[PDB]
Amino acid sequence: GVPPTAELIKDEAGFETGSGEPQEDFVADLSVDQVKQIAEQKHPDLLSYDLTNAAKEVVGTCTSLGVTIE
């Protein structure tokens, strides 16, 4: 249902494409709160019970693109 992650990130990230090399090339950042919202948009698309876990899933595609956190 709800759109995919890769995109929901490129929105609040303020950028379009990732980096040739993830974690090696930080394309953007994301406050913890920002991830607390995304995790809410995909409540159905994820198996997790608590919002805590839902994040780990989302927060897993970021550092793997150059999307640091603060």
Partner RNA sequence: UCUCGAGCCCUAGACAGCCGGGAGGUGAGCUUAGAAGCAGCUACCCUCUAAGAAAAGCGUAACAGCUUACCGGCCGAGGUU
Residue ranges that bind RNA, judged by CB under 7 A? 4-6, 16-24, 42, 45-50, 53, 56-58, 60-61, 63-65
Please, what sign has the CA dihedral across residues 32, 59, 66, 1?
negative
Q: How far is the CB of 33 from RNA (least distance, A)?
A: 18
Place of tokens 């991830």: 35
Rounded to the nearest 5°, which phi and psi values hold at 52?
Answer: -55, -55
Q: How far is the CB of 30 from RNA (least distance, A)?
A: 14
Between 23 and 31, CB nearer to RNA? 23
